[PDB]
Amino acid sequence: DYIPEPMDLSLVDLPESLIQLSERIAENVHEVWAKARIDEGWTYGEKRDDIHKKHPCLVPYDELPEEEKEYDRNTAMNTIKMVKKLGFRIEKED
Amino acid sequence: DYIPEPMDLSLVDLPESLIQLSERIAENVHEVWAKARIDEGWTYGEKRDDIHKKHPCLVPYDELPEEEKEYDRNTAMNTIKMVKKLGFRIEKE
Ligand SMILES: [Mg+2]
Structure with missing residues (x-):
């Protein structure tokens, strides 16, 4: 019975100067994700494993597989687009 | 050898009108997360299970346990704070 129905942000316009920073964000x-997981005793492991608290994404960001990095940049951008869709201006300062 | 060191955003100021919308965001x-997972064959299961592609968070947002919603809102705010920290202004139109 559950069907996810995310909002259509395909036409939200973000400043190019911000998209360029996708990777920083x-x-x-x-x-933040990894500090939280690590604080709860999680460590790096080749295979994900709830019992030994093993996660393969517990590596420096630069070392993530590129599709995980795509996922993260895209998530960051969805969130910000959602803020612009709810009626906030976003502009680079001077 | 790997120690996460996220930036300190504790002192970044967001409009209150935006924080009020945390839950929408x-x-x-x-x-978005749940649609992606479900498209790749994942379904709801009370225990997480990579073999059967089972995840207990594949429920409507409202049904999520409160600490999971807490995590989701805080993450949303971290991301937006980081934009403000990188030199962008954010203001209600
Ligand atoms: Mg597992």
Whole structure:
């Protein structure tokens, strides 16, 4: 009975100067995720494993497989697009 | 050898009107995640299971346990704070 129905942000316009920073943003978010997991005793492991608290994405961001990095940049951008869709201006300062 | 060191955003100031919308944002972000998973064959299961592609968070956002929603909202706000920290202004139109 559950069907995800995310909002259509395909036409939201973000500043190019911000999209260029996608990678910074995804990186910080990954760092926060990994500090949280690591604080709860998680460590790096080749195979994901709930019992030994093993996760393969517990590596520096640069070392993530490219599709995981795509995922993270895209997530970052969805979130920000959602903020622009809810009626906020986003502009680079001077 | 790997130590995560996220940036300190504790002192970044967001409009209150935006923080009030945390739940809308986190929800939509949950929908995007759940649609991607479900498209790759994942379904709801009370225990997480990579073989049968089972995940207990594949439920409507409202049904998520409160600590999971907490996590989702905080993540949403981290991301937006990081934009403000990188030199962008964010203001209600
Ligand atoms: Mg598992």
